[PDB]
Amino acid sequence: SKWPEPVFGRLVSPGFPEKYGNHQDRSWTLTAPPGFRLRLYFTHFNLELSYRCEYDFVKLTSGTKVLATLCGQESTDTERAPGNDTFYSLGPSLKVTFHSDYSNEKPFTGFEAFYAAEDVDECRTSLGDSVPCDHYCHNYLGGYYCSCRVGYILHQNKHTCSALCSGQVFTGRSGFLSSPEYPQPYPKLSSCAYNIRLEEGFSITLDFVESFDVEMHPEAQCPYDSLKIQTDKREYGPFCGKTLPPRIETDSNKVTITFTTDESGNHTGWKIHYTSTA
Amino acid sequence: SKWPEPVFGRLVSPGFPEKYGNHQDRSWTLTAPPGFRLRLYFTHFNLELSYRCEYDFVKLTSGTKVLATLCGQESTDTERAPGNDTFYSLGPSLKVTFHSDYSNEKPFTGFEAFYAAEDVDECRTSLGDSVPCDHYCHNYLGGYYCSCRVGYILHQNKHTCSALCSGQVFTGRSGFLSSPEYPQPYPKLSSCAYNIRLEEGFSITLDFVESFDVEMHPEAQCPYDSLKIQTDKREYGPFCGKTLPPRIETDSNKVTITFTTDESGNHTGWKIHYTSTA
Ligand SMILES: [Ca+2]
Ligand SMILES: [Ca+2]
Ligand SMILES: [Ca+2]
Ligand SMILES: [Ca+2]
Ligand SMILES: [Ca+2]
Ligand SMILES: [Ca+2]
């Protein structure tokens, strides 16, 4: 219900299209709305040529960086003329500076430049392996939004996808149980809780199977990702490393398994096969 | 004691407090002794600001985790400056990494950081984790040690408190007898021994009376906690499970009850009322 305002304009050297004079200094600060960057190009460029544009120049800077230093008419080995190149602001702001020195041996016409704001694509551009979203990144005008696959919920940090893996209440007495996505990497910032609740007088036995991969610390044990098992009379765990933990035999009919994950890592996780006797 | 690295120290960007240069890379690995962690903070911080600190940064890592990525002077929406924040190592080690890219358009002054070792308090958990001691936990500089309540003795594992429940010699003809702390959970790694010595020609009768709770096995009987009874003419037990066992009638004037517990469990235990006839 609220939309960005357009931002666009035209910049010229003093007196354009007539020849620019000596000892002139101009600067324009251009600012796009949040989520936008600026796009600038030159329809006309004809300045005094000099080594590294020491005499006359047009300087484009953005944020903390110098985007370009331009002079002459056609780009050389150590100088740059803009040609049909396009220049982009870093962030929403862009400064344009024009300077002429004490003399022009020829009648130089200066420059005509045009600029326009365009939406930043936070999902595709400024992207290496670093996607700002855990699952789905949605670009829109002036921003972006994150969403998650089914069976997840967006964390409060608005980027991480937390599994909905609590609430599983098993009553079938022989069965399997697992970390999310296994054997794919288990999700970040998740709190899983699995409850085996069956008839009284029965005793359960739990078995880890196949592969095991939980984030470990060099000299500490399991401070990051914590996998623990709980009978109403006793506690077991936490299990880490990359070796399948030994069998466990419970006295109780009701058992609770909890799996907690922290903000980082791509570890595969765990399987558990539980059986039964009297 | 003595350690190769000092209890306190100072790290600065190359050339501090003068402007740092381009294409610079530094890394310091700081390591405290076991039982200590490292605490690091910044007295001065002024780096080039960039989206996600891609240009210049200080990265604090510990173990496998990145504690922080820092740039700028004051923290923004997607960037972090340390301010007066304190950073803590996970375990005794902590790595500091400094990097600068190809240019500095302003005189960025870099950073001054200080670190100090501090004792880990193994006794004071956030207590979402377990307590390392059975009874009393004592913290000291560089370590901790355990102790027990009166009537107990510290087990060889230096953490578990074993009850002193041997030595009870009953001569009274009618009476009660019990697992330690009943009806509170009976202690771990304890070996209790109760001796009933009565006049010749008399016969004792034993009765479980209130609650009965001893660690049971799925398909076996009593391999963890073992409660056994011994007359000079017979042996009874071991008794486990969680149902009050039937009455027992001894021929002997002499009875010895032995109760053994394992390293884990919170089971309540047992009472026994014994009487006598001719
Ligand atoms: Ca000139
Ligand atoms: Ca956008
Ligand atoms: Ca993790
Ligand atoms: Ca830099
Ligand atoms: Ca300590
Ligand atoms: Ca026990």
Author numbering:
A (entry chain A), B (entry chain D): 1 to 278
Paper excerpt:
The lectin pathway of complement is activated by complexes comprising a recognition component (mannose-binding lectin, serum ficolins, collectin-LK or collectin-K1) and a serine protease (MASP-1 or MASP-2). MASP-1 activates MASP-2, and MASP-2 cleaves C4 and C4b-bound C2. MASPs are homodimers that circulate as zymogens bound to the collagenous domains of MBL. Each MASP comprises two N-terminal CUB (C1r/C1s, Uegf, and bone morphogenetic protein-1) domains separated by an epidermal growth factor (EGF)-like domain followed by two short complement regulator (SCR) domains and a C-terminal serine protease (SP) domain.
In particular, MASP-2 CUB1-EGF-CUB2 (subsequently called MASP-2 3D) was crystallized in the presence of citrate that chelates Ca2+, and although Ca2+ was bound to the EGF-like domain, the CUB1 and CUB2 domains lacked Ca2+ and became partially disordered as a result (Feinberg et al., 2003). This resulted in one MASP-1 structure at 3.7 Å resolution and three independent MASP-2 structures at 2.6–2.7 Å resolution. For MASP-2 3D, 279 of 280 residues were visible. Interestingly, the three structures overlaid closely, with RMSDs of 0.682, 0.871, and 0.992 Å over 276 Cα atoms. The only notable differences were in the N-terminal seven residues and in a loop within the EGF-like domain (Thr125–Ser130), probably reflecting flexibility. In the MASP-2 CUB1 domain, Ca2+ formed contacts with six oxygen atoms in the side chains of Glu48, Asp56, Asp101, and Asn104 and the main chain oxygen of Ser103 (distances between 2.3 and 2.7 Å). In the MASP-2 CUB2 domain, Ca2+ formed contacts with five oxygen atoms at the side chains of Glu215, Asp225, Asp262, and Ser264. The firm identification in this study of the three Ca2+ sites in rat MASP-2 now resolves a key ambiguity of the earlier rat MASP-2 structure (Feinberg et al., 2003).
